[PDB]
């Protein structure tokens, strides 16, 4: 007889996730300021990383966190991002104190817990931008033409964030973001 797995085994995540940090430095390229922190693939290792790092509300404005599937870089130019896009949450200045950390934590949970069911494979990762004019949180998906998947993810995400029907959140493709000034392909 061997030991019972339940008593000593870590709780495996469906995917391995990598956490990235971005710090704004004017002298360098956008890419150069993007850096890997750390990867994990269990619930326990998720918490070990989360619990020792700064809350987003405490980061210096100009900085980002990004949680992305191992092997997917948190940039448009990644193979899995190029034809993709993002569900974007736009937060006003007061929401840094009330919602930012709550919404970001909920987003991580949606990611690592695979809350998107059949469409988990469409999810690339998520990004929180800490910015003076207003913080942003976003889930990145792989294909902006996948209307069924993109739309399912939006709906799940909104309800998990607990946002009411009056709050309209949009999905833009990265190709549009990269190449145009600030329309939504979908709303939720």
């Amino acid at each position: 007889e061997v030991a019972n797995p339940e008593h000593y085994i870590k709780h495996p995540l469906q995917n391995r996730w990598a956490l990235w940090f971005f710090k704004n430095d004017k002298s360098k390229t956008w890419q150069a300021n993007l850096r890997l922190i750390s990867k994990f693939d269990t619930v326990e290792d998720f918490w070990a990383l989360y619990n020792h790092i700064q809350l987003s509300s405490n980061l210096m404005p100009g900085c980002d966190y990004s949680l992305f599937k191992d092997g997917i870089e948190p940039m448009w130019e990644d193979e899995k991002n190029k034809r993709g896009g993002r569900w974007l949450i736009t937060l006003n200045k007061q929401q840094r104190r009330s919602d930012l950390d709550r919404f970001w934590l909920e987003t991580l949970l949606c990611l690592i817990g695979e809350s998107f069911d059949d469409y988990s494979d469409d999810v690339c990762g998520a990004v929180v931008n800490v910015r003076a004019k207003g913080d942003k949180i976003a889930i990145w998906t792989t294909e902006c033409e996948n209307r069924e998947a993109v739309t399912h993810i939006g709906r799940v995400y909104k309800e998990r964030l607990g946002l009411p029907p009056k709050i309209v959140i949009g999905y833009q493709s990265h190709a549009d973001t990269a190449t145009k000034s600030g329309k939504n392909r979908f709303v939720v």
Partner: peptide, 12 residues
């Protein structure tokens, strides 16, 4: 496939 609810995850 591994799915975890938010309540399960928050317990850790």
């Amino acid at each position: 496939k591994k799915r975890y609810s938010r309540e399960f995850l928050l317990g850790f």
